[PDB]
Amino acid sequence: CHDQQRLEVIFADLARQQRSWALYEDEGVIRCYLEELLHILTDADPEVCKKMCKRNEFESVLALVAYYQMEHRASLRLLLLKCFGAMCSLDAAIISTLVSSVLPVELARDMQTDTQDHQKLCYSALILAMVFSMGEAVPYAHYEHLGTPFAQFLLNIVEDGLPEQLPDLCVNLLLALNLHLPAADQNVIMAALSKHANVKIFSEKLLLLLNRGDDPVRIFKHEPQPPHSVLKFLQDVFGSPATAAIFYHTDMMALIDITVRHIADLSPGDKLRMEYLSLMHAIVRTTPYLQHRHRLPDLQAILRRILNEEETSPQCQMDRMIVREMCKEFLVLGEA
C-alpha cells in the first residue's frame, strides 16, 4: 500500500500560466522524486504501477509527457526517460499511449536540436526505439518530425558519427520506426534510403544483424509480438530497386548466403522461415539475381525440399504457398 501512496504523491506533485509546479522547484528536489519514481516502477508490484499509470485514461502518463516538454534541465529529462522506459516495460497499452502522445515528436526534435548532449541523445534514441517496438500505427502528424528528414538524420549518424554506442542505437531506431509502416512504397524510411545518402555502414550493420539472427528491437515480452524487425526491414528494402541499390554486389552475395543458409537450417514449423523465403523472393524481383545466380543450385534444392515436406502446420502450408509463388513468377527457381 506504501508504493501506491508514494506514486500518488509523486504523480500529483509533478502534474501540479499553467506551468508545472516542478519547474519552480530546486533541481535536487525533483531529482529525488524522479529517482523514487524510477525505483517504484522497477521494483514495486507491476499491477500497482500499472493501475496508477492507467488511471483516468492514462492521466499520470500523459502528465509526465507534458512535464517533459516543459522541463529544461537535462539531468531531470534523463531520469524521466528512464521512467518512461520502465513504463514501457510494464504494459503494451502504456506503450500505445506513449507512441500516440506528443512524446515521440519531442524526443526526435530534441535529438536534432541538442545533439551535443551524447548521453541524453543515447537514451532518447533508446526510448524512441522502445515506444515504436510494438509496430502499431501512429498519428499522421508525427511524420512531420519522425519522417524522411529524421531518418536521414539517423543515417548520417550511423555513417559519420559525432565528434561508439550511438550508431547501433540509431540502427535499432530505424528498424523500430519501420515496423509499423505497412507499405514500402509509402515508407518514409525507404524514401530516405532511396536518396542514397550515407547508407554504406548502415547496410553492413544490417548484414551483421541478419547473420546473428537477433532482433534488437524486440526488447519486451508484450503481445502481440510484431514481425522480426530486421527481416521486415530487408523485405521493404527489396520492395523497390531504388532501395535495393544500397547493397553492392559483394554485399548482395553475403546477404544471399545468409538467407539461403537460414531457409535451410530452420526447422519445418518455424515461423521465421516464411520471412526468409519472402525476403529471397523480393531479392529475385528487384535485383538481377538471375544474371549472376549466386547460390542458385542450393536455392533450387531446398525450395524443392520444402515443397515435398509432409508437414501439415499452417506455417508450412504458408511456406509452400510462398515457394510456389516464387517458382511461378520465376520458373528457373523450380528447376532441379
CB 236 within 8 A of CB 181: yes
297 within domain boundaries:
no
CB 203 within 8 A of CB 162: no
Q: CA 57, CA 235: separation in Å to the nearest integer?
A: 37
Which grid coordinates are listed for 266?
530452420
Is residue 34 one of the residues assigned to a domain?
yes
- The dihedral of CA 166, 146, 135, 37: what is its sign? positive
**Nearest-angstrom CA–CA distance, 241 and 218:** 28
To which H or E segment does residue 143 belong? none
Q: Which segments of the chain does DSSP mark as H helices, in order? A: 2-15, 27-43, 46-70, 74-90, 92-100, 103-113, 118-131, 148-159, 166-178, 188-194, 200-212, 229-237, 241-244, 249-265, 273-286, 289-292, 296-307, 314-329
What is the C-alpha separation between 108 and 101, in angstroms, rounded? Answer: 13
Residue in 305, 318, 312 with CA at minimum distance from that of residue 275: 318
The DSSP secondary-structure symbol of 295 reads T
Q: Copy the grid coordinates of residue 321.
A: 504457398
The Cα–Cα gap between 158 and 161 comes to: 6
Vertex 95 angle, CA 83 and 162, to 5°: 65
The rounded radius of gyration (Å) of the Cα atoms in the chain is: 23
| Resolution of the PDB structure in angstroms | 2.2
Domain presence at residue 60: yes
Residue whose grid cell is 501512429: 138
In a domain, 147, yes or no: no
122 with 115: CB under 8 angstroms?
A: no
* CA gap 305, 47 in Å, rounded: 49
Measured CA to CA, the distance from residue 277 to residue 264 in angstroms comes to 10
Three-state DSSP at 167 gives helix
Alpha carbon 73 to its chain centroid, in Å, reads 28
Please state the φ and ψ torsions of residue 26, each to the nearest 5 degrees: -60, 145
Distance CA 74, CA 114 (A): 10
3-class secondary structure, 303: helix
Rounded Cα–Cα distance for residues 194 and 241 (Å): 9
Number of C-beta neighbours around residue 191 at 10 A: 19
Opening angle at CA 270, ends 268 and 271, nearest 5 = 135
Q: What DSSP assignment string belongs to 20-80?
A: -GGGGS-HHHHHHHHHHHHHHHHHS-HHHHHHHHHHHHHHHHHHHHHHHHH---HHHHHHH
The DSSP symbol for 263 reads H
Q: Using N-to-C axis directions, what is the helix angle for 92-100 and 118-131, rounded to 10°?
A: 110
Taking the C-alpha atoms of residue 194 and residue 239, their distance in angstroms, rounded to an integer, is 12
Whole-angstrom Cα distance, residue 200 to residue 246? 7
Phi, psi of 7 (to 5 degrees): -60, -40
Query: 201 and 109 in contact (C-beta within 8 Å)?
Result: no
Nearest Cα to Cα of residue 290 among 327, 263, 325, 258: 327
How was this structure determined? It was done by X-ray
In 3D space, the residue among 331, 333, 185, 201 whose CA is nearest the CA of residue 263 turns out to be: 333
The whole domain housing 75 covers 1-90
For residue 57, tell me if it sits in a domain: yes
Note whether residue 215 is domain-resident.
Answer: no
Which residue from 205, 217, 207 is spatially nearest to 176, judged by alpha carbons? 217
46-50: list long-range contacts, CB under 8 Å, 24+ apart.
46/90, 48/3, 48/4, 48/7, 49/3, 49/7, 49/90, 50/90, 50/91, 50/94
CA dihedral 35, 38, 39, 45 (to 10 degrees): 150
Q: Is residue 258 part of a domain?
A: no
* Structural domains in the chain (count): 1
How far is the CA of 242 from the CAs of 11, 184, 192, 238, in angstroms? 49, 11, 11, 9
Distance of CA 93 to CAs 136, 166, 179, 184, Å? 11, 28, 17, 27
The verdict on residue 221 lying in a domain is no
How far is the CA of 231 from the CAs of 11, 289, 291, in angstroms? 40, 19, 24
Euclidean distance between CA atoms 71 and 91, whole angstroms = 25
How many residues comprise the chain?
336
DSSP code at position 142: G
- Please give the DSSP secondary-structure letter assigned to residue 331: G
Four-point Cα dihedral 57, 58, 59, 62, nearest 10: -130
Name the residue among 33, 95, 103 with its Cα closest to residue 70. Answer: 103
